[PDB]
Design a protein around this ligand. Structure first.
Ligand SMILES: O=P(O)(O)O[C@H]1[C@@H](OP(=O)(O)O)[C@H](OP(=O)(O)O)[C@@H](OP(=O)(O)OP(=O)(O)O)[C@H](OP(=O)(O)O)[C@H]1OP(=O)(O)O
Ligand SMILES: [Cl-]
Ligand SMILES: [Cl-]
Ligand SMILES: [Mg+2]
Ligand SMILES: [Mg+2]
Ligand SMILES: [Mg+2]
Length: 135
């Protein structure tokens, strides 16, 4: 995996808000790779020349083991402290795979959260990810 960057040196990333249905009431979070007791929004680095929507879908397959119907771009979110900029899309989950790349390789977990609970668990370590749900 080759990391890529915007012209200002921020790492380029993409992520999806993986909703259980079109109602957008429950979202799938995954565990942090290094701190299994924490939750994050699945996402990761864009590859060279990779469209952000393609990266987002690829990352959620790898990290969360789901596929679905890609929806709208929510926004582009900067983490000033960590110097990265993430394109965040809606994805409506239609397939949940039982063994997926990060489960097998690093024991990553996934869990469904009501939106307000997702915001709560993201706030302390991932306040920018909590802000994905603001609108
Ligand atoms: O603190 P760290 O070393 O453990 O890793 C951070 C983050 O580092 P940063 O804050 O310095 O940017 C990594 O980005 P990098 O800057 O190293 O490229 C990031 O990878 P990412 O962008 O998602 O990249 P992909 O591998 O998904 O493509 C990783 O997410 P995980 O995928 O879940 O491991 C994060 O862990 P956490 O959020 O706790 O799970
Ligand atoms: Cl839902
Ligand atoms: Cl973040
Ligand atoms: Mg990843
Ligand atoms: Mg990646
Ligand atoms: Mg990642």
């Amino acid at each position: 995996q080759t990391r890529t960057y915007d012209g200002d040196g921020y790492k380029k990333r993409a992520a999806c808000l993986c909703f259980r249905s079109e109602s957008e009431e429950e979202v799938l979070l995954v565990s942090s790779s290094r701190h299994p007791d924490r939750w994050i929004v699945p996402g990761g680095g864009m590859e060279p020349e990779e469209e952000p929507s393609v990266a987002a879908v690829r990352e959620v397959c790898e990290e969360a083991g789901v596929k679905g119907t890609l929806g709208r771009l929510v926004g582009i979110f900067e983490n000033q402290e960590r110097k990265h900029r993430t394109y965040v899309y809606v994805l409506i989950v239609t397939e949940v795979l039982e063994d997926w790349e990060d489960s097998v390789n690093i024991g990553r977990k996934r869990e469904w959260f009501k939106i307000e609970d997702a915001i709560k668990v993201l706030q302390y370590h991932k306040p920018v990810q909590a802000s994905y749900f603001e609108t």
